[PDB]
Structure 1
């Protein structure tokens, strides 16, 4: 458990060291950027492809010292040619295997990849925003390698942004000018850099697609909601997440004091003095104590992370979320670009690790009161309003006589992913105008090719298609290897990067380019279909009604006399 793969991870980080060097070439090139010239280097893949790599391009000022917790400031445009032949490090975070803190505050970088720099005509630009709960993640190629996408004629850009309290501290007093959402404002400025720089790498600035998985999906949705990013891109793909997910959003303004207190602060709960302490502390001490900010009860109520995107307590210079997610769906420019959304066929299997420890988690399901949406439920969660709402949940997911893991994990698929998706689509349908949304369901199961997230649900061996299982067919990671191109895994890489690039190009995810799509006719959802159609992606590709629709609809029935709140 962990120490097992702790040494594994160690003896697979040193691979990535011996393979990264080996796959480096001598072919350097220089591209224009608005801040000055940048030097990249051609790299190779295990499939005998190659691509140009520019890593460590700053899109903002290093947010250190006085810039800590504040909105990003654009960088200093440099003389000469800046080295981008190496990664820069990841935002400060608790690494999943080591367990202790890694990364740096100097993390506001993006990386640009493409198989050809002078291309004949201009390529679609895909911008990937990583997930990780807004508390972990990176654009390092041990985790998100572009090796599969650069088989296609696209420009791929992978961004970083501030995580944890360093990204998402929020304070009421306008005075202190720490409204929240620093990490989302980082994303905004990365997208602004992309808009005005992608042409320098062969990109088409009229054909940008933003996509992300989990917190990166919530992020992509936030970038579709704010008027700050209006017009800055043209398609969005939400993979296992949106901004009205219960975990995508927390009111955290009174949690800074608690963080300060855990770290040694002596003084009041006044924000000015709380800030003066948190500005002086070592970044790693804060990040390691993040752990403990949420209260014992906040956890019962399913608040997942102490700091994250929030409704800002006032709107200044660079605001992005002046209002709650459901309300921004109203005039949001992004409802009017082509969109694809989807989930895996067993998201909640991504709770085995948690559940393993104190299986008491399961008895929750005896009334399911804790999974009632927080906005409908009472603080104690025993108002007859709440016990009866929970009975509705409880019936949709408890299958027989007594609750288990599968019911709990199945319940989690809906609480954290499918139900919010449903709520978003229906809100979207009436804050709208003609704009296709397409649904997929990722249902391809394999153990011969994996990604690191599998050992951070330290599961190994276990079937079903968990949250994050799809990333393996989009991105290279240091646990990957060269599969034979007959294999079901290689074919799935082909299909997934093919569909995503097809969507990025025309706003329509279908083509006869895709072996296996030959019998797929895949149309969007509209305001009126009673039941959602989706492309189910397995060893075969098949259009089907979402199997989850029945459980979704009963979740909707908790709102039968609170319809305004649905």
Structure 2
């Protein structure tokens, strides 16, 4: 029976047999006052503190959010939907510790992605007990507010200042600073890690001064704040806050009145209108995201990046080989998970309309021009592959590569990887390739579980990834030093070396997507 006392009270955990060993899980420890009522839309507040013993023996509620109902009964999509009740009262974190209680363990803190509109730390692919069993690190993850309830902004106004969910992430990192040594953790060795919006989040904590002393290093999976979906301009943010006001009949004249009104609507009604705060939208819409609030984020982050203002420490950044594929079956004419989606040229053109809504005609032709001159005009899946590349390179790959270059230029070691293994168990079709989100399970160690139908080659890839990640976290270098592994070079502006992750040989290459990111990065931002 395992009780540990925290600044805020006592908590009891639960024992778990993992790979003939034991890990102790403390699931659902709260970490702020629930943000209800007068608290809805505001920065998270001090956890007040309990006598008695909190039982942290189940996952807690997920924050309120819309669910994906595009493919009901389909594991591919439904594995991302929340798997505990939704509730405004959702500010809880989990801790996983090795048994016996370690003495001064390195801490991995996961930030889930979800477009800032969705996600929960209790997904199966985010289970921290393999890491803690196998590398005897500690693993912490947090639920943070998503959608309007976490990122609604009316700037300057503390009733709705913006970035609420980013400060919930922040107050969780404070909670580990204050409390983790009690579970055996080293607060001086914390690595943040995250995927997609959770990676974007990690990147902004690197820019945020209030985070600067709550962690040591950073991992960025398929995401960084300079991605085009990751930050909302102050313009659009008020437009959206007021479009929301409109839609819930809350338009007012006093702005503390709009908020006061909005703080009365039921959850379902805010959720139900989020999708429409915006005229055209796309499968990659982020209607309520991070903003420059003068508080968490003191200036446009692209400026802060360029001018070297951010935490100086090492970063590990990566992307998957087919990032863009997963979003095509949510709206691009011709695309299906249930056939092979050979689309035509005219369909590709229509696709650009779905993905690049407004979006000058010359903008769109220039993408066509870049992506459709091939070698050669023969192959039927030419147009199908090109549209996935537009979307991967634009939305994820080129921005992760430019973050890493700008970041490495100021001095610190960075490592870049290029993940290209397709999971033997992937439920989406072949044509969709090495999809977005599908490294997560390798990073968390799921394939180490033999009982589970992954290949030998996959267990091996996983065991090695897990060791590189845990070496980065403790040592700032992601090598696997024992099993004659390919050495992972640092990424520099100049040679731009990266390491490829696959079940066969892993290689050192140079200048991923060189010709394509020259398009996205220098020319496109102009159209």
TM range (shorter): 0.7 to 0.9
CA offset at residue 226 of structure 1? 0.3
Q: How does 1:241-280 map to 2 (within 5 A)?
A: 241-251=223-233, 252-263=237-248, 265=249, 267-268=251-252, 271-280=255-264
2:497–2:508 Cα contact (<8 Å) kept: no
Given the alignment, which residue of 184, 187, 191 partners 1:205? Answer: 187
Given the alignment, which residue of 435, 438, 441 partners 1:466? Answer: 435
Is residue 410 of structure 2 the alignment partner of residue 425 of structure 1?
Answer: no
Partner of 1:168: 151
Partner of 1:294: 278
**CA spacing shift, 1:445–1:428, aligned 2, 3 Å:** same
**Mean alpha-carbon deviation: is it higher for 419-428 or for 65-74?**
419-428
For 1:349 and 1:142, how far apart are their aligned partners in 2?
A: 23
Partner of 1:522: 488
Partner of 1:440: 417
1:392–1:558 Cα contact (<8 Å) kept: no
The secondary structure found in structure 1 opposite 2:106 is strand
Partner of 2:46: 74
Partner of 1:17: none
The secondary structure found in structure 2 opposite 1:248 is coil
**Number of residues of Structure 1 aligned to a counterpart in Structure 2:** 502
For 2:493 and 2:157, how far apart are their aligned partners in 1?
A: 44
**CA spacing shift, 1:68–1:364, aligned 2, 3 Å:** farther
Is residue 153 of structure 2 the alignment partner of residue 188 of structure 1?
Answer: no
For 1:74 and 1:411, how far apart are their aligned partners in 2?
A: 44
1:436–1:525 Cα contact (<8 Å) kept: yes
CA offset at residue 134 of structure 1? 0.9
2:191–2:215 Cα contact (<8 Å) kept: yes
**CA spacing shift, 1:329–1:41, aligned 2, 3 Å:** same
For 1:141 and 1:534, how far apart are their aligned partners in 2?
A: 28
Is residue 6 of structure 2 the alignment partner of residue 37 of structure 1?
Answer: no
CA offset at residue 335 of structure 1? 4.6
CA-to-aligned-CA distance 1:276-318 (integer Å, 9 cap, x gap)? 221001112211332222212x54xx87121111122xx3xxx
2:445–2:462 Cα contact (<8 Å) kept: no
**CA spacing shift, 1:499–1:337, aligned 2, 3 Å:** same
1:149–1:475 Cα contact (<8 Å) kept: yes
Partner of 1:309: 290
**CA spacing shift, 1:481–1:362, aligned 2, 3 Å:** farther
CA offset at residue 372 of structure 1? 10
Given the alignment, which residue of 202, 221, 236 partners 2:218? Answer: 236
CA offset at residue 546 of structure 1? 4.9
1:38–1:83 Cα contact (<8 Å) kept: yes
**Mean alpha-carbon deviation: is it higher for 196-205 or for 285-294?**
285-294
For 2:65 and 2:308, how far apart are their aligned partners in 1?
A: 32
CA-to-aligned-CA distance 1:515-547 (integer Å, 9 cap, x gap)? 4xx241221111322x44334333332222354
CA-to-aligned-CA distance 1:222-246 (integer Å, 9 cap, x gap)? 1111011112211111000000101
**CA spacing shift, 1:400–1:205, aligned 2, 3 Å:** same
Partner of 1:152: 135
1:362–1:408 Cα contact (<8 Å) kept: no
Given the alignment, which residue of 503, 506, 520 partners 1:555? Answer: 520
Task: Provide TM-score, normalisation by structure 1.
Answer: 0.80
1:355–1:361 Cα contact (<8 Å) kept: no
**Structure 2 stretches lacking a partner, 5+ long:** 73-77, 336-342
1:51–1:116 Cα contact (<8 Å) kept: yes
For 2:238 and 2:373, how far apart are their aligned partners in 1?
A: 35
**CA spacing shift, 1:364–1:399, aligned 2, 3 Å:** farther
1:346–1:410 Cα contact (<8 Å) kept: yes
Partner of 2:107: 125
Task: Provide TM-score, normalisation by structure 2.
Answer: 0.86
**CA spacing shift, 1:71–1:236, aligned 2, 3 Å:** same
Partner of 1:217: 199
The secondary structure found in structure 2 opposite 1:157 is strand
2:212–2:311 Cα contact (<8 Å) kept: no
CA offset at residue 31 of structure 1? 1.1
The secondary structure found in structure 1 opposite 2:303 is helix
For 1:363 and 1:463, how far apart are their aligned partners in 2?
A: 20
For 1:399 and 1:532, how far apart are their aligned partners in 2?
A: 29
**CA spacing shift, 1:485–1:142, aligned 2, 3 Å:** closer
CA offset at residue 176 of structure 1? 5.1
Partner of 1:283: 267
Given the alignment, which residue of 11, 24, 30 partners 1:58? Answer: 30
CA offset at residue 356 of structure 1? 5.5
Partner of 2:338: none
Is residue 318 of structure 2 the alignment partner of residue 342 of structure 1?
Answer: yes
CA-to-aligned-CA distance 1:411-444 (integer Å, 9 cap, x gap)? 11101111112322333244x23x1000111111
For 1:224 and 1:493, how far apart are their aligned partners in 2?
A: 27
**CA spacing shift, 1:354–1:485, aligned 2, 3 Å:** closer
For 2:250 and 2:211, how far apart are their aligned partners in 1?
A: 40
2:93–2:141 Cα contact (<8 Å) kept: yes
**CA spacing shift, 1:122–1:497, aligned 2, 3 Å:** same
The secondary structure found in structure 1 opposite 2:302 is helix
For 2:51 and 2:58, how far apart are their aligned partners in 1?
A: 19
**Structure 1 stretches lacking a partner, 5+ long:** 1-27
1:52–1:113 Cα contact (<8 Å) kept: yes
